[PDB]
Amino acid sequence: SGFRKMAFPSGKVEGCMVQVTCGTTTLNGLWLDDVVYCPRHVICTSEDMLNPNYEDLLIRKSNHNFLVQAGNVQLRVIGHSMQNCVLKLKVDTANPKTPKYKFVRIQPGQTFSVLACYNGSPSGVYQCAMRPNFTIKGSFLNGSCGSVGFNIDYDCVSFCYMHHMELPTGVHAGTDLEGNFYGPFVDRQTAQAAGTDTTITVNVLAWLYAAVINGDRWFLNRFTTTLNDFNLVAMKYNYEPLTQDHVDILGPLSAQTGIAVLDMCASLKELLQNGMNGRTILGSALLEDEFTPFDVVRQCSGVT
Amino acid sequence: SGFRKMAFPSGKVEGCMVQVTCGTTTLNGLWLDDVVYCPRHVICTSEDMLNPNYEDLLIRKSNHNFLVQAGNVQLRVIGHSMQNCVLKLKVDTANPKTPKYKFVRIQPGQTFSVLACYNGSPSGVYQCAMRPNFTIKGSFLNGSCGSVGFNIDYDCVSFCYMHHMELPTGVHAGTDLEGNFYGPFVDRQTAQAAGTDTTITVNVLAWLYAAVINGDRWFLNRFTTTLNDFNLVAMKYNYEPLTQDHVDILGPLSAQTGIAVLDMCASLKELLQNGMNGRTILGSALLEDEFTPFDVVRQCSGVT
Ligand SMILES: Cc1ccncc1-n1ccn(-c2cccc(Cl)c2)c1=O
Ligand SMILES: Cc1ccncc1-n1ccn(-c2cccc(Cl)c2)c1=O
């Protein structure tokens, strides 16, 4: 019993972190096999931050200008290339600690763990969701660029995020491991609209099922609703519209608890319309949307 | 910017986790040097759970009855001893992945990371506080016993907790690494009073400083208070009395923000008396007490 915002064990990712320095900028890199991946803005100086011409900036750099250090040992760079917003530095040594891994592009509403790093050294690990507007609400300071987000399925690490930027609003933006930004963002020091965010409805319902499993049940009521009626409420409260695909993904939780998905939607409708009345659910005084239905099943069943 | 409930990177601890089986019970062990530490209740069966005679139960076991497996490899047990509520199994091989470590007894109100494990395999990592009543509100299922809590200072892991029990109330209890329970608990399947808990005042103040540093400032007011006046409010709201020692530990945060500790106490007094009025602080709709002043400084300065 108990339900916590749990991150994946970070060990397999810690063994991939390196420091990358180019000129006067230092950030983190991810060393997998004989390639080090890092944000391309490592080649920038302050003057070329408002609108860097990355192609021109990279043309002034040679393999020997990319200083890559894995703890105390220096890696020899034998190639460099830019793919979208990431640099790929080919090194002469494959990382002996490379885990089984994949590069994935996650969907908005999905969750992942972040290993925050500075100077190639791990600082901490936390779980978060990719917002529907493709930003993340992380904890990142200057020097954290190149820190990565990931999920782990048994012995395989699926890398889904690399940190690049803090928007002027204090929220974070980054790319997949092929250097493609999530959302409309560009790697420039400019104000950029993130767009309307919404609450991840399917996740809030999953967390309400986690609450019932762990004994917080005060929010269960005598009511039911329909997808149409619930979606009118979701529209009013800036929640993502619930679809049959979301209802289907909540199937295992509905089967485990015996609470029909539309019945849980009626409880969520009442909490949206009436608030929590000074009460808490799983130690939270707001409706939590950073646990997917898969997260709830995993945590409630002890998957390792 | 951004503030998250961050856990320490778990890698150094993952390399110490082993599975321990005795008879029909399997739980986790911590392999440091040539010793494996695990909860002594691994030697129990269901019949002897209400009140086990651990001395008698252990007398029926020999070194060869303790099956210790580190991933796929079996460790040879050459000795066994019970120290308080923990068993120490001496093995013939020192763990090659033993980090620099210490065993510490943490104080109530201090925080630590937990690496939840099942069958010797890491499942997830989360940060929590040792409650003032010496319980933890964790996320643990059957099989998680032997999972440990720790802090990391550079390359040294300070192990402070080993999980033993879930009380009938769903909260958790465990020991230091010498097998001494935190709190009044005993390792028996019996209802046990945990005692009145309180909110960790110094931590809530630290988190309010973290909020101001990250831009959430709506709760700052034109008022001040005294330790005496604030403590009358803390008494009414079941908060720990604030002392000069707590004020002194908040010194760095008060210096960084320019907000006098008693001025922040006046903001906390107003939030206690008036509530949040439907607003949030660092994404929370309640007053958070799981960040120590040290945690706030570390996260706000990027310590690795
Ligand atoms: C200062 C900071 C804090 C947290 N995460 C990231 C940062 N951070 C460090 C550099 N950049 C940056 C901003 C815009 C464009 C480009 Cl190419 C880089 C940034 O946002
Ligand atoms: C079932 C469970 C779930 C989460 N954490 C722990 C457990 N859990 C597994 C065994 N015990 C136990 C209870 C009382 C006394 C003793 Cl010696 C052992 C327990 O509490």
Curated annotation (Swiss-Prot), chains A, B:
Activity control note: Inhibited by pyridone-containing alpha-ketoamides compounds 13a and 13b. In turn, alpha-ketoamide 13b (tert-butyl (1-((S)-1-(((S)-4-(benzylamino)-3,4-dioxo-1-((S)-2-oxopyrrolidin-3-yl)butan-2-yl)amino)-3-cyclopropyl-1-oxopropan-2-yl)-2-oxo-1,2-dihydropyridin-3-yl)carbamate) inhibits SARS-CoV-2 replication in human lung cells. Inhibited ex vivo by michael acceptor inhibitor N3. Inhibited ex vivo by compound 11a and 11b.
The protein, known as: 3C-like proteinase nsp5
Effect of residue 132 to H: In strain: Omicron/BA.1, Omicron/BA.2, Omicron/BA.2.12.1, Omicron/BA.2.75, Omicron/BA.4, Omicron/BA.5, Omicron/BQ.1.1, Omicron/XBB.1.5, Omicron/EG.5.1
Subcellular location field: Host cytoplasm; Host Golgi apparatus; Host nucleus
Subunit (UniProt): 3CL-PRO exists as monomer and homodimer. Only the homodimer shows catalytic activity. Interacts with host FBXO22; this interaction promotes the proteasomal degradation of nsp5.
Residues of the active site: 41 (for 3cl-pro activity), 145 (nucleophile)
Function: Cleaves the C-terminus of replicase polyprotein at 11 sites. Recognizes substrates containing the core sequence [ILMVF]-Q-|-[SGACN]. Cleaves and inactivates human TRMT1, preventing tRNA guanine(26)-dimethylation of tRNAs. May cleave human NLRP1 in lung epithelial cells, thereby activating the NLRP1 inflammasome pathway. May cleave human GSDMD, triggering alternative GSDME-mediated epithelial cell death upon activation of the NLRP1 inflammasome, which may enhance the release interleukins 1B, 6, 16 and 18. Also able to bind an ADP-ribose-1''-phosphate (ADRP).
Residues joined by cross-link Glycyl lysine isopeptide (Lys-Gly) (interchain with G-Cter in ubiquitin): 5, 90
Reaction(s) this enzyme catalyzes, per UniProt: TSAVLQ-|-SGFRK-NH2 and SGVTFQ-|-GKFKK the two peptides corresponding to the two self-cleavage sites of the SARS 3C-like proteinase are the two most reactive peptide substrates. The enzyme exhibits a strong preference for substrates containing Gln at P1 position and Leu at P2 position
All copies of domain Peptidase C30, residue ranges: 1-304
Organism, as annotated: Severe acute respiratory syndrome coronavirus 2 (2019-nCoV)
Range within the parent protein: 3264 to 3567 of 7096
Gene: rep
Phenotype upon changing residue 142 to A: Does not affect ability to cleave and inactivate human TRMT1
Effect of residue 189 to A: Does not affect ability to cleave and inactivate human TRMT1
Cytoplasmic side, ranges: 1-304
